[PDB]
Amino acid sequence: NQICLQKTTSTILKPRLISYTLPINTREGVCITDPLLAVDNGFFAYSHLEKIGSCTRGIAKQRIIGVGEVLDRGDKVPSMFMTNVWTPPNPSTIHHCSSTYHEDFYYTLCAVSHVGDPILNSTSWTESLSLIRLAVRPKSDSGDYNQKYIAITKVERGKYDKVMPYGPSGIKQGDTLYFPAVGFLPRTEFQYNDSNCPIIHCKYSKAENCRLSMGVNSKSHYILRSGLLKYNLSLGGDIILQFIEIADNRLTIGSPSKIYNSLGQPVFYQASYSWDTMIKLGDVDTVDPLRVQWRNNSVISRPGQSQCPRFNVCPEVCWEGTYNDAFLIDRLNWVSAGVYLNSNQTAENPVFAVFKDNEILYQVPLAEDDTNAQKTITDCFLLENVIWCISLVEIYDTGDSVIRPKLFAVKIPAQCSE
Amino acid sequence: PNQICLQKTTSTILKPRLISYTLPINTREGVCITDPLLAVDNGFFAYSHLEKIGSCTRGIAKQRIIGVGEVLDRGDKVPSMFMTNVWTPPNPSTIHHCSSTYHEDFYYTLCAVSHVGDPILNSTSWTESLSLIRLAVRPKSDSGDYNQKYIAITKVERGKYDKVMPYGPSGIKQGDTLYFPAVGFLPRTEFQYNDSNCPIIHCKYSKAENCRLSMGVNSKSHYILRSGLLKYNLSLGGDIILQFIEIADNRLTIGSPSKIYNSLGQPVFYQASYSWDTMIKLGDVDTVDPLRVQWRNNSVISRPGQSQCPRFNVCPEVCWEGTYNDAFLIDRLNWVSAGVYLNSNQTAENPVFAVFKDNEILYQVPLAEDDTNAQKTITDCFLLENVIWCISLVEIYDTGDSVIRPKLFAVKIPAQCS
Ligand SMILES: *[C@@H]1O[C@H](CO)[C@@H](O[C@@H]2O[C@H](CO)[C@@H](O[C@@H]3O[C@H](CO[C@H]4O[C@H](CO)[C@@H](O)[C@H](O)[C@@H]4O)[C@@H](O)[C@H](O[C@H]4O[C@H](CO)[C@@H](O)[C@H](O)[C@@H]4O)[C@@H]3O)[C@H](O)[C@H]2NC(C)=O)[C@H](O)[C@H]1NC(C)=O
């Protein structure tokens, strides 16, 4: 299997809107938010928060966490079919979910909070997690095989006060699952030498900017450190979660990340929520301790606001950015594929690009230039011999009754012709 | 060979004392200690509670603790309690209805994991999930798994019932098998009952349907509750399996918190009166499986209720009102029992310890005042040297104390009548 590996300005990329099923309702004045997508081994997982009003200020109505199957039906375009749906009782308590596949089940670790977003009310939030095990091929009358609620028996956080799932999906390594997560370490306990802040090429950048930008605000009580939550399924009835922090190599505030397996080894993506606006992506060198071999990427970034806009590399105290991930599709040329937002300061213009560390080979707009879009989650796979890529794109302020995310299906061309 | 005072006396032969019990120490304020549990067994004890910051009903769950220890006479010629092991589940809000039972060198406690709240108040929403914590009464050094372990229930053989739950403080052991107090959720549509069995012989304002409709939280309740015993055979303990045993038709009452204990050789069973059978339901178990209790013709002990089914109401009405005030058999030849009751027609007040026969209260003593709000009481009695002793945990509420918590008393049964 090979792909087009030459720079073409032609439209060799033709995005198609995938066929996906969901539970049916007749509700109106609704926005589908906090999305999730996790494709693995011909299966998928999907979650969202339904709001009665605006996508920002609406009242929470229904959270659904669902699993299913991706399929080819001779149309040679992937289709999605939901097989199991779980609807928690309290929409407003469920936060930052992350789904990981193993055996015949999707394990989704979510965060329970009665104060609000646990990242914005860190000090007020009391740590609480939840694990939902859903079967991708349900059966009839099998007690706690289709839907099981797993209870954490102990959470090893180490030096960290609180830990929380913070990302859409994770990997498996044998019978041990690794979720994207974040740790809440007090600022006073944070070990950082400002002599390691890269302000040796920046004028108005202070050496203190890196450290102070490791929390939501400069005078925050905690810093945020992205990492992994380990759930060893072979450890009997003790459902123990263990936190694994990321290393200092290109360190940035704890952001939503996603660990995935491709062509053998694992890969890691960390959203650029601070001053390192260029994409953070790379092969995981070690899963424990976590060390990522970030790519020398110079072409793909993310939108920001005023202090840290797109293509900013010099340290500043900021907390801006969007989670737009990318999926390795060829390790020998490190070609990745994903959706990025082609605007400097606003969340607009989604563009599916098959890019390299210093070159966007071919891209294709997924909407118009002033189309508002935010979080993108892209997972790719091999159907027969052709690489296909499913991309969930968050669209907002469409002026519709049921504003929904747009799920795409983009086949990576093999030839650079036509 | 041990003797007890078998005569009625208006004097104060009974002198209660506040027991010394050690718990892990904090210094936080504005807290309520709820969902208590006490179990005494072979000179050992188990204790559980839920710490709530704020209100005793609508407070934020802070700390669930599960504990075991030793009951010893340290020369003060009074029983004392000393904790040896503790476990603090990580999500306190999910732990519900816990039930401890002792075997060999461990206390096994079957709890309920729920994210909808009290499974009895949100029965249709509850997804059955159970937890089992094996704790060592005498811990050893660096002995992981020996000290604290979780026995994932794996299988639950409910039978004709949809959901099953631990619903009672303590249980017994028969050889290598563990019997926990339990409840059983049956959809009304499958509840077999002959309304002609509803005793409305001397109750003019009572219909016959008033018995079948009082077998649920409400008359239209989707589920009826039937108390029983969840079994656990350790002798084949590899892939643990729980098995429900239902209580017989004799004196059927809505599934209420129950207690099975061994006294003077044979098992005894106590069911709370959460419906119109306001009189105490106590008696020797004739057969554990099937569960058959030979309830007593007790005509002196009842429980506070409300307007419909108040204290000393023997007539079938549709009610779900009552408190858990158990009792412990102290003499079988004269069937004398010992426990705490609340002396108020229609309020949870005036806790009163009493040693009582079927149709007579021999001697009794007030524990607090006459207006002290008090709810649940768990009473377990035992023999220290040659003197019968009784430990009663009383739930005391409404005081405004910085730390509201249960009151644990130790009472010596008079042997000769002063
Ligand atoms: C992301 O980008 C970094 C670089 O920015 C990549 O890592 C670098 O890789 C180059 C080689 O490709 C390394 O360069 C080598 O450095 C040796 C020592 O000089 C370096 O010393 C320190 C580290 O020891 C560096 O920090 C410093 O800046 C110097 O660059 C040289 O001796 C080497 O020379 C040898 O090879 C060259 C090339 O053939 C010959 O001409 C020489 O004669 C000699 O044989 C070489 O120049 C560099 O050290 C690496 N940096 C670090 C920090 O490790 C990452 O690989 C890249 N990541 C991805 C995913 O692409």
Ligand SMILES: *[C@@H]1O[C@H](CO)[C@@H](O)[C@H](O)[C@H]1NC(C)=O
């Ligand atoms: C998970 O637990 C099993 C059983 O103790 C062990 O054999 C395995 O190595 C563990 N895997 C880890 C810690 O990654």
Ligand SMILES: *[C@@H]1O[C@H](CO)[C@@H](O)[C@H](O)[C@H]1NC(C)=O
């Ligand atoms: C975004 O900002 C950079 C600043 O270096 C600038 O070079 C670039 O042209 C800007 N892009 C747009 C679309 O304005």
Ligand SMILES: *[C@@H]1O[C@H](CO)[C@@H](O)[C@H](O)[C@H]1NC(C)=O
């Ligand atoms: C409690 O109930 C009994 C029976 O109804 C009654 O005789 C008694 O007077 C009641 N007590 C009070 C204080 O009303």
